[PDB]
Design a protein around this ligand. Structure first.
Ligand SMILES: C[S@@+](CC[C@H](N)C(=O)[O-])C[C@H]1O[C@@H](n2cnc3c(N)ncnc32)[C@H](O)[C@@H]1O
Ligand SMILES: C[S@@+](CC[C@H](N)C(=O)[O-])C[C@H]1O[C@@H](n2cnc3c(N)ncnc32)[C@H](O)[C@@H]1O
Lengths: 357, 357
């Protein structure tokens, strides 16, 4: 199988396509990706017949910025008859996957696929039972078998294939399912919350997003990001000239510092987390983030970088290489990830974990 | 997992070890193999932690001469308590293999493991049921999941691991199960029969060992090899100065040519199969085989090469490279395999399939 599907934000197919061509190219896994404006996905077609499975094994999924999720697929099934919906899909997956761990029937995140989404979520149930009988799915859900994807690009038109659970998005359509909490001060709270789900493996949450940690939130007003930190039982220095929500102040966990996030110097030495959602030039925000990490003012950080109008993939990769250059220059070991989150529009979210010897 | 177990003929551990070190070395999969004189197996210990699974994926199993079978294993389980035999083995395989396709509980092919063999064949049944409940084995047998191996080197001492069904021996202990037929003229009939099982994939038998084919058997007296060809409903020219068994002559399928296999020139142009089990110097037999293939006197061939006293792996590889050199020199495309069959002692059996454009 030579085709790899990447789900992306509608209208970012060109970046998603530029990135995967670039990063697969770097491993001599050559091919091309067409771009269908606003389709909400991109297909990378490898030149070599089995390079598709090589690509989704060896290139780290966490290193792609503009893909929400990916999977290898086979040939496009067209015109699935309403009266015979199961057989053709089973025929495409048999011998392709044996005893898979999970099924996900997905669409592109466009408005035109909204009805089709409802169909897919319900179709999952009877389809899963049938794929079980055929031995394509294990009788029990399993983390350590590939996820089976059936991907509908239009009614009666779908691809079938898979991805490895240790190298993909754990989430449906690459979008964690989050309800907005009415007591949170801003909708942007879901950016940090989503970021927690995307970047920190769920079984490490109690350890890395730990009850009792100090955190700093730069540009905190009115407190959407602070809220997520408070929900984790952290103590927070919220840094802004604007006021913090009273609901947050009442918890007893928030210290409001009336300052400029860009000018703020932490007096404290044991801050675990710094988060920053300040609206400003990407090169400047990146510079600030590098200061924090190089000085060991925080152990981990989540922040946002706004994208330019053109050369978005190139520009944001430049920003990241700046921060990495600053780390190398001072001999500092860190892991860096960036992802255009579902709740990110013309921006990218970044996570950096610094290490001490 | 860095350890790969290779089953071999007892007393050929040094060759088996020389070969795997050489061929894994060629792929920069470095490590070492200790040699326990007559143990009937060899363990290749890779330097890199996960190179074990790389080795049994990427190096073609069909290219090893002195291994009957191989599989990756983990740590040696010692002292399996009679009162608790299942739990420790399940604990070693869980997370290591999920929904495996098949179970094989094997020992080394030594006389000291004869009682242990009987234990292993019976233990398979309750062990398989338990591994199913734990999700280590699928509830149904499957070709397209890895084979799960539990390997006993002494009572209560075993390794656990796996191999890929598309890159291993399909046979238990790498030994196809054959009963000797009383109407066959020689016990050596089982060499050719075993060779058919080892070299020709079972689903290609009716096509490649086809009813109606012409074959030539050089050094045919008294007719053990001829017998296997006759059993496939082939027409056979049995070439020898010694007499063919009357039982064979009565079938109507055997033409006895009173000649020297080394001097014999086929008058016929459409011989599918030539087989040769003539006792003679390996370089000379090889030369004869190269004549047959280069002149297109047969489409496929199975023959035997006797091993020298020392440098057996080196010597027999030399012979094979001679034949390959002769093919290259005349622009001839062929696939070559050689395996020290179970019914081979101080010799190796070879199969060559020639191709026409
Ligand atoms: C888009 S809001 C997001 C706030 C937060 N993420 C939330 O959910 O409530 C960004 C905040 O950063 C603050 N900000 C932007 N630039 C700043 C600067 N240079 N110094 C201090 N605050 C700044 C703004 O006042 C604003 O309150
Ligand atoms: C070890 S026997 C095996 C025969 C056969 N594989 C079977 O199962 O009956 C080898 C045979 O090859 C024959 N042979 C050896 N060298 C030969 C030669 N140079 N010309 C003709 N026959 C030869 C011998 O006479 C002997 O019958």
């Amino acid at each position: 199988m030579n085709k790899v599907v990447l789900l992306c934000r509608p209208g970012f197919e060109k970046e998603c396509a530029a990135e995967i061509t670039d990063k697969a190219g770097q491993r001599e896994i050559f091919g091309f990706a067409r771009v269908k404006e606003n389709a909400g996905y991109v297909i990378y077609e490898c030149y070599q017949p089995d390079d598709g499975d090589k690509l989704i094994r060896e290139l780290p999924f966490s290193s792609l910025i503009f893909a929400r999720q990916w999977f290898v697929v086979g040939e496009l099934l067209q015109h699935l008859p309403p009266e015979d919906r199961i057989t053709p899909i089973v025929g495409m997956l048999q011998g392709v996957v044996e005893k898979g761990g999970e099924l996900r029937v997905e669409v592109a995140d466009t408005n035109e696929s909204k009805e089709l989404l409802k169909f897919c979520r319900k179709f999952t149930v009877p389809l899963r039972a049938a794929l079980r009988d055929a031995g394509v799915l294990a009788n029990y859900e399993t983390p350590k078998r590939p996820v089976v994807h059936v991907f509908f690009i239009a009614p009666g038109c779908c691809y079938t294939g898979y991805s490895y659970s240790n190298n993909n998005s754990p989430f449906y359509m690459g979008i964690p399912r989050l309800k907005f909490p009415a007591d949170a001060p801003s909708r942007s709270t879901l950016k940090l919350e989503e970021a927690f789900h995307v970047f920190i493996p769920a079984d490490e949450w109690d350890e890395r997003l730990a009850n009792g940690m100090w955190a700093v939130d730069l540009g905190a007003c009115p407190g959407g990001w602070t809220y997520q930190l408070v929900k984790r039982n952290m103590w927070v220095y919220s840094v802004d000239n604007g006021p913090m929500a009273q609901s947050l102040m009442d918890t007893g966990q928030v210290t409001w510092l009336r300052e400029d996030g860009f000018k703020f110097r932490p007096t404290r030495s044991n801050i675990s987390w710094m988060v920053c959602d300040m609206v400003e030039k990407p090169a400047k925000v990146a510079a600030l983030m590098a200061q924090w990490l190089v000085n060991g003012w925080c152990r981990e950080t989540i922040f946002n970088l706004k994208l330019p109008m053109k050369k978005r993939y190139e520009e944001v990769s430049h920003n990241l290489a700046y921060i990495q250059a600053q780390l190398d220059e001072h001999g500092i070991n860190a892991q860096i990830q960036a992802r255009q989150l579902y709740h990110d529009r013309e921006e990218v979210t970044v996570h950096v974990r610094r290490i001490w010897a």
